[PDB]
Amino acid sequence: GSHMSNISLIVGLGNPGSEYAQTRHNAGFWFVEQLADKYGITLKNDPKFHGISGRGNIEGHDVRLLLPMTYMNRSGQSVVPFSKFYQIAPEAILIAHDELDMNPGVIRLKTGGGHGGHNGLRDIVPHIGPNFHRLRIGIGHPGSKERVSGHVLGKAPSNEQSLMDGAIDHALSKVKLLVQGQVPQAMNQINAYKPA
Question: Which of 25, 50, 97, 118 is catalytic?
Fold first, then answer.
């Protein structure tokens, strides 16, 4: 099982399929895929947990990675049984996700709170509660309430993509702190990120 607030499960939220891979709602997938490549963690088919998952060493810690393949609004159907099976408490979970309420190039580490309208988080919090950590990857908000689906299922223009990519890269450099349980320092250093 997990141990205290040493992060040992990192989840990236998104939708399956090439048609969604470049969309804003897959920001969490981008982060976790890049993290897996950085540390040489194999992301392999995990049909039992309706996802793609991996396990490997990050800075001397045994960490699991998970990409639900359920579609976004059914993400809990992967995350919940996976975390329960491996006895990973929410306090040891980091979920990376797109955040409508923040600008592209803004990234923050948050502990607790609600789903903020995010349909992936909405499927997870009812089951494990809110006390997991979140890597909120800013994607911006569309023109109004009605445009949300068109925004999150859109491919960002190059400038916004560059801003997100830089923020994601910064966060990758701070995962060492997270797997070491240094959540306060990680929060300070992630939240301080500026693109320019």
Answer: 25
**Which strands sit side by side in the sheet containing 133-138, from one edge to the other?**
44-46, 51-58, 61-68, 9-12, 93-99, 133-138, 107-111
Binding site membership: which residues?
20, 71, 73, 119
| Model resolution, angstroms | 1.4
- The percent helix, strand, coil of the chain (3-state, each to 5) is 40, 20, 40
Residues in Cβ contact with 92 at an 8 Å cutoff, skipping those fewer than 6 apart = 2, 3, 4, 5, 6, 7, 8, 9
Q: Which domain holds residue 178?
A: 1-196
Residue in 150, 144, 134, 140 with CA at minimum distance from that of residue 102: 140
CATH of the domain at 28: 3.40.50.1470
Q: What residue numbers does the annotated binding site for cytidine cover?
A: 73, 119
- Note if 25 is an active site residue: yes
Binding annotation for tRNA:
20, 71, 73, 119
Instruction: Count up the domains in the chain and report the number.
Output: 1
Rounded CA-CA distance 129/138 in Å is 23
Method used to obtain the model: X-ray
Apex 26 CA angle, 160 and 69, nearest 5: 170
